[PDB]
Amino acid sequence: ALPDFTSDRYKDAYSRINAIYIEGEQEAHDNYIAIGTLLPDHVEELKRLAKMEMRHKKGFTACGKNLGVEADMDFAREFFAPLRDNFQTALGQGKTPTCLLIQALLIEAFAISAYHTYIPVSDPFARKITEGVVKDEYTHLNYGEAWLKANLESCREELLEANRENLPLIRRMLDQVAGDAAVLQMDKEDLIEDFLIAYQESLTEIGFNTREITRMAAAAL
Numbered sequence: 001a002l003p004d005f006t007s008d009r010y011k012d013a014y015s016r017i018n019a020i021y022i023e024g025e026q027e028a029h030d031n032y033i034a035i036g037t038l039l040p041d042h043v044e045e046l047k048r049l050a051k052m053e054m055r056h057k058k059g060f061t062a063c064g065k066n067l068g069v070e071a072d073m074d075f076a077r078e079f080f081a082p083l084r085d086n087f088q089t090a091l092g093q094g095k096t097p098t099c100l101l102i103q104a105l106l107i108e109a110f111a112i113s114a115y116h117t118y119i120p121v122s123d124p125f126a127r128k129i130t131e132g133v134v135k136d137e138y139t140h141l142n143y144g145e146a147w148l149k150a151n152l153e154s155c156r157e158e159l160l161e162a163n164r165e166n167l168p169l170i171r172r173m174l175d176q177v178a179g180d181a182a183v184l185q186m187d188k189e190d191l192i193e194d195f196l197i198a199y200q201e202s203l204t205e206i207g208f209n210t211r212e213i214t215r216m217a218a219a220a221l
């Protein structure tokens, strides 16, 4: 059954999960702009992507206002700190393939999983907003997949390294959100399945074979 969106129990968990949505959209915006410093000829497309992320952020901000819940932004910022630190490191070293794997692949897949899972248990206001959002993040996966597919032969090793370092962070993120997510009536196994399916499909599209992908997914352990 649907959660009681008015309960103190729900609002408490929501303050953190919703803050994660909001912060995630903000960092996605920042990341796409940042990638523009690495792909100067991609700037106008990246600006469109980043603007979409700000629309997403505004929508989740609105979802919070609607339930009367103050977002715990401090919690969210710490939650994203490991991937954010790794993204910045890559950015400073000009490592475009690592930046794309972290943002366009890992974070977008995490988003699509969270949002797909949240929809059937969301309040009616948030549901319409979130239904809009999910259609968009496939556009973002497509963007990352396209560039990486086009450049695979020069960046294969970097990508294996990027996955090795960053996929475990996604696993720890899922472990950390699981409790609050369950209060929101979201099953951890659904979140994991949806995430892994999205990621595997991106890797397939990029040109990795089944063995390579199996070895990659394994690094989560």
Ligand SMILES: CCCCCC(=O)O
Residues within 6 Å of the ligand: 020, 021, 022, 023, 024, 025, 028, 053, 056, 107, 108, 110, 111, 114, 137, 140
């Ligand atoms: C769960 C928050 C992640 C959203 C990141 C994005 O919109 O690309």
Ligand SMILES: [Fe+3]
Residues within 6 Å of the ligand: 025, 028, 052, 053, 056, 111, 137
């Ligand atoms: Fe988004």
Ligand SMILES: [Fe+3]
Residues within 6 Å of the ligand: 028, 053, 108, 111, 137, 140
């Ligand atoms: Fe996105």
